[PDB]
């Protein structure tokens, strides 16, 4: 080539650092010279296409999207390399979507499935993260739980009397979103069966819990 532009290719592959010295600089050929102007992007203003600084525009878009995702009142956890097949993991997930955090963790603790245990761990971590961010505990609810296929390992093994067997260990990922919903009402789970009620009655314990009137916190002494 008579004029090899620094972003063009000639006996070379596209290397980012070698073909783009500065991303905000656009190189052109003017008067048989490499002219390095500022990069502009076209935006629609007042019905015409105006040119704005491309680097500033991209940084602005990224920062605005980031701050919106931040101040959106929810907590999203992305667990990777979960030791379970994506099929069985989604089968176990299909029961938790659209539940309160309380009932979700209760079902996970009372279930007998590896997917349920893994998502219990995920719920615990997401609840800790939401508490750290500043969300309340009682108004937490799972909003979007999904799993997509992840890494994979292939393991061969010998068996009795010399037979090779193949196995495909799978792994999936988990996207778990806890959201704050003030209009949530939780069903009364404190109900006891009549058997336990009359058993505690025979024992002498109060079947009804003792509510003690606790005074409020006052800083009058200071």
């Amino acid at each position: 080539p008579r004029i090899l532009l620094d972003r063009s290719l000639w006996k070379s592959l596209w290397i980012t650092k070698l073909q783009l010295p500065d991303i905000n600089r656009w190189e052109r050929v003017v008067n048989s010279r490499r002219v390095t102007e500022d990069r502009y992007a076209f935006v629609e203003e007042e019905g015409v296409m105006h040119k704005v600084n491309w680097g500033l525009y991209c940084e602005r878009l990224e920062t605005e999207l980031t701050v919106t995702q931040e101040r959106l009142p929810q907590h999203t956890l992305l667990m990777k390399a979960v030791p379970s097949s994506w099929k069985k993991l989604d089968i176990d997930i299909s029961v938790i979507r659209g539940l309160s955090l309380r009932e979700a963790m209760a079902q996970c603790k009372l279930s007998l499935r590896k997917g349920h245990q893994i998502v219990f761990r995920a719920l615990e971590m997401a609840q800790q993260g939401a508490e750290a961010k500043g969300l309340d505990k009682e108004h937490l609810r799972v909003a979007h739980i999904s799993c997509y296929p992840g890494p994979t390992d292939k393991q061969i093994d010998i068996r009795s009397k010399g037979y090779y067997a193949w196995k495909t260990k799978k792994s999936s990922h988990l996207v778990l979103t806890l959201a704050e919903d003030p209009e949530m009402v939780l069903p009364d789970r404190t109900c006891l069966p009549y058997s336990s009620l009359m058993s505690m009655k025979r024992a002498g314990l109060s079947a009804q819990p003792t509510v003690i009137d606790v005074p409020a916190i006052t800083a009058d002494g200071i």
């Binding site: 299909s94 029961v95 079902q107 789970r189 069966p193 505690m200």
Partner: protein
């Protein structure tokens, strides 16, 4: 004679009662009046209180 099964034949199993009652089903639970833990009616705790009286 065996052949690959379309996605529709892969979703016929969830229509039966065997698939629904095995994987996707919730629990009836309450709070252990002595342990303050979720408990199914019929299964108790190891603690001395939960063995003498059934919470």
């Amino acid at each position: 004679p065996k052949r690959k099964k379309n996605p529709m034949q892969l979703r016929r199993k969830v229509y039966g009662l065997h698939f629904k009652e095995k994987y996707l089903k919730m629990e009836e639970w309450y709070y252990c009046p002595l342990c303050a833990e979720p408990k199914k009616p019929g299964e108790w705790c190891r603690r001395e209180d939960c063995r003498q009286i059934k919470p």
